[model samples]
Target chain A: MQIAKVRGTVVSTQKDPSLRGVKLLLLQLVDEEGNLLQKYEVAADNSVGAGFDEWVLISRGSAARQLLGNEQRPVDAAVVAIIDTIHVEDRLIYSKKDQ
Target chain B: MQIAKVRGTVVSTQKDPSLRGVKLLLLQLVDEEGNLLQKYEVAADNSVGAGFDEWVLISRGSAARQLLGNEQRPVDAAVVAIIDTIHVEDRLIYSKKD
Candidate 1:
């Protein structure tokens, strides 16, 4: 699974039939060093309830489709989890409660 | 569809069961401005026989699994087409035979 930080939401009153009930969240991918990069992914969130400004774990491609009833959807990304803490090499990098 | 240039091939004698006959190509993605970025994707190429240094279009995720008998594989990306020309507005960014 890939990791990122949710920047905001994208609401669409009109959309493709396959995306009827999905929630789209704007994400900025984070590197191993915990720095958010320029790369972005607009992911559908129907599994884990992700909140704004939360660091999340995203499953990309087919794997994303496997668990979210997304097998027949056009989705390429999904927010899998809302990360509570991030530690790199024994050094704490992020914590939801601390932030 | 995503555009990328084939950087090289990744051959593995030992592999996963679902990837037996798949050819993996190392790709460097190109942005809208035509500059190849630091981003990368190792895609399965059983559809288009993309060659080295050729720019190709990639269909990612389940869509990649939709064709080339990829429906049951764990593939995340696949080479869909070999690019012949790339144009941004009236400016031709790339052309194969021009």
Candidate 2:
């Protein structure tokens, strides 16, 4: 899974009905040390209620579809885990409290 | 998932027993417009028979393990689809046919 930061949400009314209740969020790739990158992709929220500017874990491809319990969900990316804190070796590199 | 190109394969004889028949491939990232990038990663083949110099779609994370039907597999990336052609707007940007 790729670590990313939530930037914002996406609103669409004309999407497929299968995506009715799905939460679409814009995410920017981030490194384990919390350095954000220029690349960005929209991902489906896994209902973990990850807030804006929060760090998240993204599962791509079929793994993302399985999280929603439907392989036919037509989504390639999804938020699978919310990173509350990150520790690399002995240093506390990131924490939700600092957000 | 991401689009990439197969550059070569990796051989490992001292890996976990579960990975005996798994084929590991080296891939370079590519954009939808067919531009290859410097970034590279090793991906497990999903038995799709993708060849060298062929563009492929990669499924990352646990999705890769699911493709093999073994959640316990220690793989983080896998080639899930081979690109035969790509169309951008009304133009045929890429195709397997030269």
Candidate 3:
């Protein structure tokens, strides 16, 4: 699982029927220190109300659809967890309450 | 799934028992035009005979292990399909028989 930040939402009109109710979020990969990387992914929202600018745990590739409880879904990535806090070497880098 | 080319192989002696018979291939990501990208992944071979320099479709994340028919395994990437051809905007960019 990679750490990412939900940058925004994606609204698509034309897509696969299996993706009808799936929420898509635009995510940017982040390092341990919450620094953004150049990589970006449009991940399906498997969580409940993952808001904008929230740090999330992403499951990419086939694991993504599996985490969404539908192994046959054609999704490549999904938001599996909403991060509450991050600790790197005992140093607190991010806390949802602090944001 | 992403498009990638098998660049090399990975040999590991100390790995999970479930992965003992799995073949690991080093892959390089490629665009529709077959241009190599900077991203790379080590994927398990679920196909019969995916060889080096072959353009293959990669199933990443948990789906990788699922395609192997063993979802409980600890793999994160797998080669699911070997590409025979790739078309972009109706243009044939990659084909096994050229």
Candidate 4:
């Protein structure tokens, strides 16, 4: 998993069986130093409304399917947690964006 | 490979043999909708500590080593399952958040 921002969510009427019932999310990619990068959408079973400015967790591929509570689900990424703090090179880079 | 989250889990004992024992979690990035970003972690062995807030999975360069029981290390992103619900636009949006 890499650091990314929740841009939006995706909805597909027709998709793979494993993809069924799964939710897709659009993420704003970021650089190692916390710089923003391009954006992309990934498949997830549930994002839990990570909010507009919260640093959430995402997983992908078959692994993403596993996180859905069903190994048969087909997804590429899934939000796992909402980050509260992060440290880089002995320096904190991010904290809860929410108040 | 797109969305991500998890912070600081990198551990290097020597040098790349496909990065040996993967396990690194770092960074915390986010944006407009309830932190849809995915985290990072250099590993595949364990994440059992998953806070039942419902949202946890593990993967790496080597795919499905334990799940499918295939012996061919080296994978990329492999969290098979761990979500509750999700939505977008004017919808309910992501509930399982596992």
Candidate 5:
């Protein structure tokens, strides 16, 4: 399980057939305290819809593909859950982007 | 096509069954200029063995599992090649763990 911040939208016209109709998003990983890890991931949205600047939980490896109900989707990471409250290890994190 | 720096050994006795006998390594991702990205990855070794601080090429996603001859492997990334001479664009990178 990983926590990440939704970064951007991915627009791919030429992609693998298995990735058709998938909502791909760019994500930057976060540490337990919600600090950005500076690592990026292009993950598939499993089911729940996410928005920019939202904090989400990510699942990687075959479990990610299996969770999407297709182990052949070629995705390494997928959004498993959307985090609403910003609480981690007694710290508060407001997920809203600072515009 | 990702380049990384081998960091440490991963000795997990309770991993997925598909990872049996697989040599797992801790790696830090690298940019084209060979600079460390400070990101960490626990990836499976495809074939080429890597030593600590050595730069290596990595493949991720289904391609990684497929390259391992087991699509059933629950792996996200795998080492594809050990970088001996790291050359990117017009830069020369002596990837001998310097």
Candidate 6:
């Protein structure tokens, strides 16, 4: 899984019907130094609701299938956790301090 | 499951026999600027022998089990495919364009 920030949501009504209720979120991949690198999109099931501008861990492929909510869907890259906090090398970097 | 370049080998004689003849290669995850970010180790079954400094695609968890040889194994990360080239947004980013 990769760590990224949810920038916003993508609404594509013309997609396959299998993806009718699915939500596509814009993600910006970030490094340990907090540098934004790549921009990609991921499909989120309806169960786990993640807010915008929040840090999250994105799981893809088979790992994506192992999420508690995604059983037999063709989905991949779902948000696994909301990321309460992060401590890297003894540095208290990220925390849900504000919200 | 990320794309990385094989750096070298790791020899651990006391590992599981299921890992016998298997290869452990060092990998460095790089970004679009080709900057090394994180380092991880992946197990490669005996079949696909990747040489040093070759770009490869890694698969973890259940996807690791779907490889050509890893039948019902307990592998977390395994080399699934060696990346030949990657073209992103009309940019020839990665290649055996060596």
lDDT of 1 by residue, A1-99 (tens): 888887665444333345567766667789987888877656778888887678999887777777647777656678888999888778789889986
Taking the tens digit of each residue's C-alpha lDDT, what string does model 4 give over A1-99? 555677777777977775666667777765555567766666353535466655555545544544425455645566654555554546666666433
Predicted candidate 3 versus true structure: per-residue lDDT over B6-79, tens digit per residue? 89888999999988888888999875456788998998875446787876666566555555354678877776
Off by over 4 Å in 1: B1-59, B64-98
The DockQ-derived docking category for candidate 3 is: incorrect
Clashing pairs in 6: none
* Model 6, runs deviating above 4 Å: A1-99
In model 2, which regions exceed 4 Å deviation?
A1-63, A66-99
List native contact recovery per candidate, as a fraction of 1.
Answer: 0.11, 0.06, 0.11, 0.08, 0.07, 0.05
Instruction: Name the candidate, 3 or 5, with the larger lDDT value.
Output: 3
Candidate 4 residue runs with Cα over 4 Å from true position: A45-49, B1-24, B27-59, B63-98
Report the CAPRI category for model 2.
Answer: incorrect
lDDT string for model 3 (A1-99, tens) is 899887665444333344557666657789866888866555778655688788888876656766645566556777888989888789888899987
- Say which prediction, candidate 2 or candidate 4, comes out ahead on DockQ: 4
Q: Share of real contacts kept by model 1?
A: 0.11
DockQ value of candidate 6: 0.05
Rank by lDDT (best first): 1, 2, 3, 5, 6, 4
Summarize candidate 2's per-residue lDDT along B1-97 as a digit string, tens digits: 5667899889999999878888889998875455777887798875567788876666566656655344678887776566555443324556766
DockQ of 1: 0.08
Which 10-residue span in candidate 1 chain A carries the lowest summed lDDT?
A9-18
Residues B22-91 of candidate 4 have per-residue lDDT tens digits of 4434423333465645433433333333221234444454354553432333334444444454457667
Model 5: per-residue lDDT, tens digit, A47-85? 766788877666586757745354777877777556544
Which residue pairs clash within candidate 2?
A: none
